[PDB]
Design a protein around this ligand. Sequence first.
Ligand SMILES: NC(=O)c1ccc[n+]([C@@H]2O[C@H](COP(=O)([O-])OP(=O)(O)OC[C@H]3O[C@@H](n4cnc5c(N)ncnc54)[C@H](OP(=O)(O)O)[C@@H]3O)[C@@H](O)[C@H]2O)c1
Ligand SMILES: NC(=O)c1ccc[n+]([C@@H]2O[C@H](COP(=O)([O-])OP(=O)(O)OC[C@H]3O[C@@H](n4cnc5c(N)ncnc54)[C@H](OP(=O)(O)O)[C@@H]3O)[C@@H](O)[C@H]2O)c1
Ligand SMILES: [Mg+2]
Ligand SMILES: [Mg+2]
Lengths: 411, 405
Amino acid sequence: TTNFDQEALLYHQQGKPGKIEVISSKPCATEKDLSLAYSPGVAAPCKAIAKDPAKVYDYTAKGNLVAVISNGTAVLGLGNIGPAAGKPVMEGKGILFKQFAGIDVFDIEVAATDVDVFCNAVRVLEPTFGGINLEDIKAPECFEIEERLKKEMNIPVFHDDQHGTAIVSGAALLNACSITNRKMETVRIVVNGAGASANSCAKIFIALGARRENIIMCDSQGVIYKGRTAGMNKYKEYFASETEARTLTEALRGADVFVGLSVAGALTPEMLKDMAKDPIIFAMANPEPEITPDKARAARPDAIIATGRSDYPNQVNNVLGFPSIFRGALDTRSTQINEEMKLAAVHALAKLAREDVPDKVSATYGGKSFKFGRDYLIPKPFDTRVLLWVAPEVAKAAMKSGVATRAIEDW
Amino acid sequence: TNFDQEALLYHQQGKPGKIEVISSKPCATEKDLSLAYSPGVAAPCKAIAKDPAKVYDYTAKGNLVAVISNGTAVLGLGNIGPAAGKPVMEGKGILFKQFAGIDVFDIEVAATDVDVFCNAVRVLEPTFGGINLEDIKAPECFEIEERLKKEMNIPVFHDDQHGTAIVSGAALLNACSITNRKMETVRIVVNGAGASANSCAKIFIALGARRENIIMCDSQGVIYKGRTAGMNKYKEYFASETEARTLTEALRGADVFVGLSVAGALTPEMLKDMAKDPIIFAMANPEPEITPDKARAARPDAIIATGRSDYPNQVNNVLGFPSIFRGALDTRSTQINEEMKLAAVHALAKLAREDVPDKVSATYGGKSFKFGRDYLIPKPFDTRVLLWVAPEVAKAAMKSGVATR
Ligand SMILES: NC(=O)c1ccc[n+]([C@@H]2O[C@H](COP(=O)([O-])OP(=O)(O)OC[C@H]3O[C@@H](n4cnc5c(N)ncnc54)[C@H](OP(=O)(O)O)[C@@H]3O)[C@@H](O)[C@H]2O)c1
Ligand SMILES: NC(=O)c1ccc[n+]([C@@H]2O[C@H](COP(=O)([O-])OP(=O)(O)OC[C@H]3O[C@@H](n4cnc5c(N)ncnc54)[C@H](OP(=O)(O)O)[C@@H]3O)[C@@H](O)[C@H]2O)c1
Ligand SMILES: [Mg+2]
Ligand SMILES: [Mg+2]
């Protein structure tokens, strides 16, 4: 819909260009005000921070400030459009941080595609920020970039395209498994796609109890089988499967779970018929899914379906993750977002969906009723319980794992 | 002091720090967010991919300045490091917002090597409409600003260097006018050879001063040609043929003293042998090279400006950078060049000759102001400044061809 596009263009240019403004949180009108905000008063917190570096969190915005950082090499589904073109998306990501977790964001678009240039530039920004959310950086560069920055920086570094997606889909999968009386240890999973998100999703499924041998990964050229060499790399190699299947169709034979992280249309009804009873179908290709819940329900009335879209039930929406994840990490002044923290967020999201849904949430969604089951197995994005459930569990995981530098006693 | 305690509480209370980032557009509903983020946010991205200039139409780039420091010369605190400088950079951003309506991301960078710092900062270009370098020590700051100006296609401006040059240059033009002087024959003595001093001398030459009429002194006295002690590439440029060796000897018959050094550096005896109607810029902080009363006591015909708000003629940098960047941003300029800097000088000098509104008088407690020896430049809280200076900078950018809008 190109007129919907025009609504978006107008939105971005109307009044003042763009979507963000930086304002003072303190009085700044009078000469007295400015004698505190600036010279000579501002020397006091500077001296305090020089003597005790931790006090940077007491006297600046650092403790609530995340950088959303991209080089614009994988923007949304638009591909490598460059950092300037990606800036609206990074401003938008920042707005989600603010609206869902109260976190201030500097969106930082970096003109560097070289891994060393990019990492060298970002590493030295640490004094500015309480955390770094890497965004829309293409695979496989994003794997090296994230791992290097996590090692080199002493503040949390988290690439949402990789792990946010894994966290929310993992939560959904745990619940889908519960609803269908499945054990993770025996569930057979097919992942369609082998990019930034598929890699992390596969890894978290294993972390949640799935076996590598029960997971088959497919790409643009079919099943990633052990021995294969076409279009292969270090990361695809890890998930190369001993299977005899070569097509997506073959891989789905008797499979329990389809995880779609590829492109629209990739999954048809015929492929659906041979899946196991109560098939679990996550069709997350944007903006159009691998399949529709209706086409899926038509082929398989017993199917459980999640997608990336808010107009269908069970949206695997990344906004369920990163805001609370950084809230918990920031509030404990943590030096990392580690695996313990990611898993804590999985389990918090999963558990929340199992609770009775307050009238407030139904009223937010037009009076729709929600109860845990096949049409509701992950929290709604506009449910205010999400921050309350996920952020403290992340904070507790940071303290338990020893990456917190500030204890939080209670909420 | 109670004031330090007040300052600490100001920073620590409420939301820690001094800045918040907010949405400038509606962002409460599913519909709102379908435009602010996916799927609608793809539209401006596609527009920008096709026509790069549209980044200025659809993002905050055109109103967004990075205040960037590695914390190596923070205020008068020296090399305290990037984190400890963060309160100062947040506060600088506050000034940008309050005086020019400019949004700032303060960026504290953990790199002291010129090369590493530059390589980290120049790739941030897509984010910003302009870069204000701040509180970076000399001589590294010269090399850094020079290199970034060569690499980046947005304005790069180190305020410590050029802000004081611009405002003191406006003050100097007016001082010369008042005392019937011509810049081409004025003899100037610059005390100090650091970040700000060097730029001051360069602005004076641009305003018509002759390089031969300028003597620069540092911690070891006059910088004379042939001297090697404590020299560098930048001091070398301003090395003088003069036989003077001390600040005292240099000031004999001098018209102007520009003090960018340390307190007490200027005594009354040096003042004695200055020319009639000596112009004295004592801008050392927090205590000037000499006080206004001690100066007029020695020389009653003296015209004096300082860096302090408690005396007349405050050479305050807030008179410069807000309008300079406002003008640069509004013309979507690729540079702040010498033409733009000079445009700011002349506009500031011109505003000072205008009648001072009661609003300004009221702002400063009924104190009247009329262009003269006690009023050489606009007051910092004069709201006319942005309206006067920024349009002149924009005109300069367009005339010199660095404007893209
Ligand atoms: N919460 C969500 O809804 C969510 C989150 C993240 C991602 N996604 C969606 O998942 C998709 C990929 O995201 P990404 O960040 O991972 O991108 P990516 O890094 O580019 O990954 C693309 C992957 O898809 C593979 N592929 C392309 N065509 C295929 C086909 N017909 N069949 C099977 N695989 C195919 C590609 O194979 P090759 O490697 O061989 O080229 C590649 O592995 C996008 O649509 C994204 O919108 C959704
Ligand atoms: N608008 C304003 O009010 C304003 C603006 C900018 C600066 N200032 C003030 O000017 C002074 C310099 O600032 P800056 O940033 O330029 O500092 P800077 O970079 O450190 O430069 C210091 C300069 O002062 C020289 N110096 C040290 N002691 C001296 C002495 N007794 N006599 C003469 N020169 C001496 C140094 O000489 P060596 O090279 O030999 O070390 C050096 O050249 C500071 O007090 C600053 O607060 C005021
Ligand atoms: Mg992303
Ligand atoms: Mg400064």
